[PDB]
Design a binder for this molecule. Structure first.
Ligand SMILES: *O=P([O])([O])O[C][C]1O[C](N2[C]=NC3=C2N=[C]N=C3[N])[C]([O])[C]1[O]
Lengths: 301, 246, 640, 252, 255
DNA sequence: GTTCAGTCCGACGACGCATCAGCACAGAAGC
DNA sequence: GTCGGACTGAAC
DNA sequence: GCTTCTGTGCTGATGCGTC
């Protein structure tokens, strides 16, 4: 994920940072990036053990998960300088009644495309790439285990963009300059510079050309262009090409193989498939803004 | 400048006893029309509307609309003193951080006044549209309250069934299940049959307002927030809006 | 008139310069004036002088008021063997001040935080709450009676009863006694002087003016005509008599009455040591390594001992069959281990009547047959003496002998003591054993036994001489045994490098600056700082001043979201995390309060440092480069 | 299977409310003659015998004898939600897994029903022989409860005395001893009558009396029976329908 | 040697309960004239004085002047164990270590008895002079009780100010401020329900609401009470217990 | 004759059994 | 538990 | 049915005793 931009926001605009708790997100469809999620699940069935139990935990509090898998990754600076366990996760999605999407590229772009088009209200990832892809709401830290307390952090892209006044492209350029996975950035100018330089020079291209000293280490191959067009219009699937629906979960089909390929507590898994199934009797309660429009806010003098 | 006088002060006690609990901090909008207040609850699953028209005020003056944010637990503690039949009078200055209250006893003997501190509070407001409800039930609030309490004693999911032939309330808990019915002897008006489900984890908080009015009305339609409404004399009414349990 | 009462005047006369008549109960106002004169002085021997002046005055005018004014200076409420304690919190005191001064709690808390002292804010303020009768001036007997009443009054709504009594004492102040009452109730009297120094000022007073004189006192300066140096030589040999007399029997309730009615030279004739009274146990000195042990014990033939991580216990067996068990800090802990009291028929040989012994008690695994950590012992229950359902078993390790069959052995060589220990008890495997000791002067076996101990679940090494200085008497020197810690023996230990996140305001000597800190580890799989410990020790005065002067501008008014804290003390300031401080640790442990490292071994229980110590401000780093919770877990695994 | 109807639902309301703090679960035994429930407490120190005779109800239909294990706290949570004046009905099947409770209001605008989960339980059944207790006393219930509320306030044990014309309660503790004096009366709206054989004195736990005391609205008159060192019998006469009998161990 | 029977034990209940909250241990002096109870609080802020006279007792007989040290808690509970209408008879003889209470029921069939352990007690005696008071007010017991029960929620201390037009309470604190101006019940002399003020000079002072909440407990003995306020003087609150006695309280001001 | 050498005193820290306070509600009493 | 801190003694 | 409260735990918050 983009280096340090959470720090810039948490120092300049904590107001768009909303600490909230799990039961506040009832009914919500959530677009989960499968790649970073299975990556933390590996930290040999442990990747499946998190894939089972974290999915259960989400289902309990009205949250409907949308797992999005990666396609062709773009020309990473590190990566351009196996799917046995990946498809192992695709196996139990159908076997537990959860949908699987496959994105044309980095699934964080396809999760953000889904959010910005109304099909889903929140995502599930730790990386701010989805905010930079235009997702108005980011929901983070959900995928953590039950003991690691982690209340769930909202970010509001609309509020962030409004408070500084600096548009989406004037937020993509921030991310690139502040240190993306696509290229190095200018290690000679501090991370605090990003909001102020964007306020004074709302592009990376205008930002570099004004100051040309030997002390300003702009990238040796200056990929601060190409990432801007990538985050503007990434290689994503059509959201309405896949109407999300959450199916009846299997009561026995997973467990007949689950303890079989990886010997583990029968009682935990059988109770898990029961509890996730009973949570589907909930997921019911809704919210007034869906029925009645916001006339606006009324401000006291 | 705000000045309103009201001989029926005892209803304000009953109003603030109900509003306080679902909304700890709330904002009145004071207008030439009289006083109103709207706010949503914590989960954004319900909201309240208070309406009181200026027609019922013993004297009123207002040069412009005023927005006053107030903690309702403070007003409840204040009015836990004011006497059961007192005249209640409210006053405010053009830009003050305080609201004045003046209370006169019926016997003129015990005369009280207070001056509370305001706080700055801006809250979101939702503009409810006018609509007709496929079911309207009009019935005494005291039985409705008892039924809601009796059902959340067992289980939190309530089903409310409304039709020409009667009203039904169904629920169940880990101990088993129950059903209650009401017969036209309660009055029902309908256009289409409706049956919905809601959470008594808000209806037993709603039914606090039993002292505010002798009867309640329930307005319902398919996939629409239940409206529970209580009349306030001639001066106005109170409404609650609750999102359905899909 | 005590308002100008001046014990700083040269040549104090025990009766002529006092400010009450004899027979009267001692005015607490004078005790307060004298405490204000002591704190105004820095020189320790001048403080022992001024306290001796006042002890002499008391035994000249009002001998019965001796015992309370000791505790007015010693702050203790009785012999620790009784279990009496004041049992009042500093919050309760700050609310009592708010009631008696009429000031609201937020302002008084803010003032007390900026001054670091409840006694300073007890003055300069009034409630104007005029009673109808101006109160009776407190006596030192009355002050002590009200403090033991606060200790006695408990049960439901007890904090009301405590608040009432404390209000009453507070409104009865006249000029400056209130500050010292505020200190007195916290257990933090901050007098600048303690037990040994009060025993010294006592010894000087009781030697200058012995008991048994009728008024007016016939003799005032028992050192008269002698030169000050030979006076001092008589004072200090008498002071050593007193100290040894105090060491053989800890409680002033056995000492002070017989001191009045028999006089100071004949004290040991009555005061014999016996089973059923506890005795002051030996202390240990921190040494870094074996060359230091060899220079300290060059002439001294010495032996080696494991330092087991248990609780210190003294056992005192009477010939009638009742036997008691006592801690280091003097308390009666008997009935924590009633099963040991059930074991007494099998432990001693049939030829012996009674004894006193010292032992380290450690919890023992019945089927595993191994040691377990101090974190096992600390969770052991305390109040109930129920032996029917026993959860956690115990085994004993001997390390000294005090008393056998009617002979006192404290005065004797460790050679004859340990001989008589071995030759007069039976060992019971899994119940009670000698600590293993190896009897050599070769460094190899010593560093071998070091390794064997650190791998046999023990803390470090204990070193004892067999005869040279080996005796039990504390008064000659309290530290006759040596502790060889692993902590610096490795040259550098478990060093960690932690970011600053918060600061605590200073108090006492530390007041007017910062006085404590809160630190975080780095959690890179969240990009956030996990609070790991509070730091309060090992920084010097001028480097503390440098830490403050660097932190002054670094505050943030809000908590920045990059913090994780819970249950731990909410800090007085939030700090932007710009520097890292290298610190030292003695052990990792599973904190039920700290968030850091939760779930890497145990799900909810986080990790924190036993015995944290600051070391160095690591000025070159960036915050995220600091230690990770995964390394912290790795070290914890390496502890087993 | 059976079906039973009674117009005075309050009767069974109180019959339940008397037992709720004695035992949390019990076997109700229902047969064509009537309903019986014999059980010890949570501590073996006491026993209850509750009996309701079939002819005491307005309508009774039992064709198969049946005993159900019942969670009494559950049925308490049932009946708390109904008015006292309503008609009760209970139905049971042969496959004893759910009981139907029906509430018929005197204002017929409301009639309601609830289905409750049954449980399998085996109560340790015992035999209670009838015996001539050497002292027995009948008295009004309201003061007997007041006396218990008073004596349990000062201590945890009570001593009865039963003489030929005089009965007394006594309790002693830190703050003293309290003596309650009863003299026989022989007509008024209520009377205390003694059926003596030999004089006696016994001791009982005031705590279990503090629980027993909740049965007071079920009867005007309560009858207490004892001998030397046998348990105290306490009977509340439940109309012409039947009885509720406590049996409480005497403290040595 | 002492014996004292009184028909309306309800007064005795009410007064013991009303005293409990402020003091736990106190002494009666009993004499052939009657009973007195003077006591001080542990803060020595609030002084109480009860007086009973023999003509208020139905059957009173004291021969020797006897002091009874009594813990209020045990005897208050003993009268909680008694009916209101029951006829109560205190009994003891010379150097009796135990206090006898007889409780008599209107049914003749119930005649209960309770023995209380006495205890040693020494109390300080103080001699407050009777004097003029600058302001005197008679108020219904309920109206002052309600004023205080209310104002306990607005602050911790009340700034009283009496005057010829009407008595003012006023206070301030955490949530705001609150004023109560009781006027004088002037045009209609209802007696049972009136507020009456007499004043030579106005007086204005500050007082503690904790102790006012402790004082108001004697409201069920009389429908009215009287307040005497004077500059720098402890507030006198008085409860005239019909023709059996008087109960008086002094409150140290917060000047 | 002063840079060492040792005492002694209180700065501060981490856990955990006990043990009481502070809502919070059924409950009963009071009416 | 533990480390620093001010001062009299250590004794050369 | 309403009143304020009482008796009811349950959970939270420190004081003080190990080291
Ligand atoms: O001064 P410290 O607290 O570091 O050390 C004294 C402490 O050590 C423990 N101890 C373990 N084993 C011991 C021993 N003390 C004496 N002898 C042996 N053999 C004990 O807890 C002491 O209090």
């Amino acid at each position: 994920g983009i280096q340090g931009l959470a720090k810039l926001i948490a120092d300049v605009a904590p107001s768009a940072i909303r600490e909230n708790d799990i039961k506040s997100y009832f009914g919500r469809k959530v677009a989960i990036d499968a790649s970073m999620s299975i990556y933390q699940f590996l930290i040999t069935t442990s990747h499946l053990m998190g894939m089972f139990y974290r999915t259960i935990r989400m289902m309990e509090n009205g949250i409907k998960p949308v797992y999005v898998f990666d396609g062709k990754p773009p020309q990473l600076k590190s990566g351009e300088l196996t799917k046995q366990h990946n498809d192992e996760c695709k196996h139990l999605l159908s076997l537990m009644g959860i949908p699987y999407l496959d994105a044309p590229s980095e699934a964080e772009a396809s999760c953000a495309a889904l959010v910005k088009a109304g099909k889903v209200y929140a995502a599930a990832t730790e990386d701010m790439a989805c905010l930079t892809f235009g997702s108005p709401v980011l929901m983070r830290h959900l995928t953590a285990s039950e003991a690691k307390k982690l209340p769930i952090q909202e970010f509001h892209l609309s509020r962030i963009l409004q408070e500084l006044g600096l548009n989406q492209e004037q937020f993509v350029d921030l991310c690139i300059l502040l240190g993306s996975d696509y290229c190095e950035s200018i290690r000679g100018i501090g991370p605090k510079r990003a909001v102020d330089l964007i306020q004074k020079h709302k592009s990376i291209e205008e930002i570099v050309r004004r100051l040309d000293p030997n002390k300003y280490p702009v990238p040796e191959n200056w990929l601060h262009k190409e990432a801007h067009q990538l985050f503007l219009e990434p290689e994503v699937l059509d959201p309405e090409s896949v109407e999300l629906k959450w199916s009846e979960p299997n009561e026995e089909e997973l467990i007949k193989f689950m303890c079989g390929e990886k010997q583990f507590s029968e009682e935990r898994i059988r109770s898990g498939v029961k509890r996730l199934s009973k949570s589907r009797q909930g997921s019911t309660q809704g919210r007034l803004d869906d029925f009645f429009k916001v006339t606006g806010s009324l401000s006291s003098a | 400048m705000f000045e309103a006088r009201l001989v029926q002060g005892s209803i304000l006690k009953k109003v603030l006893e109900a509003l306080k609990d679902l909304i700890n901090e709330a904002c009145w909008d004071i207008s030439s029309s009289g006083v109103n207040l709207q706010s949503m609850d914590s989960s954004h699953v319900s909201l309240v509307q208070l309406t009181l028209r200026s027609e019922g005020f013993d004297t009123y003056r207002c040069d412009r609309n005023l927005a006053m944010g107030v903690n309702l637990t403070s007003m409840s503690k204040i009015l836990k003193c004011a006497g059961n039949e007192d005249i209640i009078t409210l006053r405010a200055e053009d830009n003050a951080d305080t609201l004045a209250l003046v209370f006169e006893a019926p016997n003129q003997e015990k005369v009280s006044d207070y001056e509370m501190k305001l706080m700055d509070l801006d809250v979101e407001q939702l503009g409810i549209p006018e609509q007709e409800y496929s079911c309207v039930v009009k019935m005494p609030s005291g039985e409705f309250a008892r039924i809601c309490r009796d059902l959340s004693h067992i289980g939190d999911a309530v089903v409310i069934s409304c039709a020409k032939d009667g009203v039904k309330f169904s629920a169940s808990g880990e101990l088993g299940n129950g059903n209650i019915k009401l017969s036209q002897t309660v009055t029902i008006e309908m256009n289409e049959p409706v049956q919905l489900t809601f959470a008594l984890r808000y209806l037993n908080f709603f039914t606090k307002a039993t002292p505010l009015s002798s009867t309640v009305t329930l307005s319902m339609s398919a996939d629409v927030p239940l409206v529970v409404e209580y009349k306030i004399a001639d001066m106005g009414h109170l409404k609650y809006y609750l999102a359905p349990k899909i | 008139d005590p308002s100008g009462y001046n014990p700083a005047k040269n040549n104090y006369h025990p009766v002529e310069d006092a400010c009450w008549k004899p027979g009267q109960k001692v005015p607490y106002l004078a005790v307060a004036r004298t405490f204000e004169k002591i704190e105004e002085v820095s020189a320790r021997l001048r403080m022992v002088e001024t306290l001796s002046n006042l002890l002499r005055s008391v035994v000249a005018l009002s001998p019965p008021d001796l015992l309370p004014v000791l505790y007015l200076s010693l702050n203790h409420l009785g012999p620790p063997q009784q279990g009496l304690e004041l049992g009042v919190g500093d919050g309760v005191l700050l609310k009592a001040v708010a009631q008696a001064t009429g000031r609201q709690l937020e302002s008084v808390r803010a003032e007390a935080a900026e001054k670091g002292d409840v006694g300073l804010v007890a003055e300069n303020s009034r409630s104007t709450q005029r009673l109808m009768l101006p109160p009776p001036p407190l006596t030192a007997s009355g002050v002590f009676s009200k403090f033991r009443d606060i200790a006695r009054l408990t049960g439901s709504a007890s904090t009301a009863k405590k608040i009432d009594i404390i209000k009453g004492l507070f409104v009865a102040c006249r000029h400056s006694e209130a500050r010292f009452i505020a200190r007195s109730l916290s257990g933090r009297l901050r007098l600048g002087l303690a037990e040994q120094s009060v025993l010294a000022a006592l010894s000087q007073a009781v030697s200058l003016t012995p008991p048994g004189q009728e008024f007016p006192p016939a003799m005032v300066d028992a050192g008269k005509g002698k030169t000050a140096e030979a006076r001092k030589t008589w004072l200090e040999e008498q002071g050593m008599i007193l100290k040894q007399t105090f060491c053989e029997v800890p409680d002033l309730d056995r000492i002070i009455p017989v001191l009045l009615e028999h006089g100071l030279e004949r004290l040991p004739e009555h005061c014999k040591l016996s089973p059923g009274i506890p005795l002051k146990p030996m202390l240990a000195h921190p040494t870094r390594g074996i060359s230091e042990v060899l220079k300290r014990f060059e002439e001294a033939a010495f032996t080696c001992e494991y330092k087991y991580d248990g609780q210190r216990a003294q056992i005192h067996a009477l010939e009638g069959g009742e036997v008691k068990i006592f801690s280091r800090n003097q308390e009666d802990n008997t009935g924590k281990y009633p099963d040991i009291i059930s074991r007494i028929p099998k432990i001693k040989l049939p030829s012996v009547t009674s004894f006193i012994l010292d032992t380290e008690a450690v919890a023992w695994d019945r089927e595993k047959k191994q040691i377990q950590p101090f974190q096992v012992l600390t969770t052991r229950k305390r109040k109930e003496v129920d032996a029917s359902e026993i959860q956690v078993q115990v085994c004993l390790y001997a390390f000294d002998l005090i008393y056998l069959n009617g002979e006192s052995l404290v005065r004797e060589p460790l050679s004859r003591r340990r001989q008589l220990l071995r030759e007069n008890f039976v060992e019971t495997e899994g119940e009670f054993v000698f600590a293993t000791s190896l009897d050599t002067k070769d460094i190899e076996q010593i560093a071998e036994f070091l390794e064997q101990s650190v791998k046999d679940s023990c803390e470090g090494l204990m070193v004892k001489t067999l005869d040279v200085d080996a005796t039990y008497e504390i008064a000659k020197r309290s530290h006759n045994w040596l502790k060889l810690k692993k902590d610096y023996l490795d040259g550098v230990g478990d060093t960690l490098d932690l970011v600053v996140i918060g600061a605590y305001l200073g108090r006492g000597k530390r007041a007017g600056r910062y006085g404590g800190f809160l630190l975080a580890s780095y959690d890179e799989d969240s990009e956030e700082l996990q609070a790991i410990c509070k730091l309060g020790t090992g920084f010097s005065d001028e480097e503390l001043e440098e830490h403050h002067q660097s932190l002054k501008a670094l505050v943030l008014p809000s908590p920045r979201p990059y913090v994780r804290i819970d249950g731990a003390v909410i800090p007085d300031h939030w700090l932007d995390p710009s520097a890292v401080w290298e610190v030292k640790c003695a052990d990792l442990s599973l904190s039920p309060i700290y968030p850091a490292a939760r779930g890497l071994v145990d799900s909810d229980k986080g990790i924190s440092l036993r015995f944290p110590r600051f070391i160095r401000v690591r000025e070159d780093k960036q915050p995220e480069q600091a230690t990770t919770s995964a390394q912290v877990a790795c070290l914890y695994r390496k502890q087993s």
